[PDB]
Amino acid sequence: EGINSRLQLVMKSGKVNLGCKTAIHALRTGKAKLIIISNNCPALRKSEIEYYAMLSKCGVHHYHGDNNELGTACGKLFRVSCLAVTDGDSDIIRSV
RNA sequence: UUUGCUUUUUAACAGCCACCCUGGAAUCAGUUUAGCUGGAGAUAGGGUUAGCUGGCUGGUAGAGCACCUU
Numbered sequence: 001e002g003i004n005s006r007l008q009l010v011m012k013s014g015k016v017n018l019g020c021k022t023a024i025h026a027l028r029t030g031k032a033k034l035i036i037i038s039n040n041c042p043a044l045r046k047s048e049i050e051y052y053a054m055l056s057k058c059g060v061h062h063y064h065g066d067n068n069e070l071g072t073a074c075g076k077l078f079r080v081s082c083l084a085v086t087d088g089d090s091d092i093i094r095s096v
Numbered sequence: 097u098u099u100g101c102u103u104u105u106u107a108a109c110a111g112c113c114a115c116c117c118u119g120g121a122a123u124c125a126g127u128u129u130a131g132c133u134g135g136a137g138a139u140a141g142g143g144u145u146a147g148c149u150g151g152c153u154g155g156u157a158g159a160g161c162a163c164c165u166u
Contacts, residue, residue, distance in 0.1 A: 019135030022120070042136065071135085077122070080135060 003062070004073050006090045007036075011074060014088035018074065020045060023084035027052040027059060032084040033093045034060045040067030041081040049082060062096050 010016060017026055026032035027049070035053055037046050053059025064070050071079040085092060 017120095017135095019120085019137060021137065022135075045136075067136090076135090077124075078135065082135085 003064075003092070003096060006092055007073055008075055009090040010085060010088040010092055013090075015086050016074070017084045017086055018076070018080045018082075020049070020082045023082045024049060024052060026084045026086060027056045030056050030058075031086060032056070032059065033087055034058075034062065034085050034096070036062050036064060036070070036083040036085070038064050038067040038070040038081045045081070060093070 017023055017032070023032065023035060027035070035049055037049060050059070050061060053061050064073070067081055068079045070081070070083070071077070074080060074083075
């Protein structure tokens, strides 16, 4: 809930790639600063992302409260399982 | 009364005519008679596949049918 403040700060300044496929696309690229995955996300899907994150090495990643939460945390009426923070005023990536 | 009625048909069989890729959606968009669908990837563009008792040729005019003359 410190992150819930700091996340919406990033989207104004920087950019974020929301959804599973665009997140994994960034990891192959090695261009994703961190991966945020929803708790409600399918169990198998997260495993693939956090394997990819180990290979990308600066995948790092971090868990939330909930799937439907994570969209409205962004400021989106649709819902999101996974983010990928591409690069913001707030250093989300250093502390977390 | 350029009129009213009857005939003008084609068999089984055989060949041919939901899902993926690109992509990344809020000023939300697509859509049914009705509702539903969509970052667990929508519209759109290009494909793949399912099908009926669909279309074309073969079967098949030699047959069947309606008439006419020695």
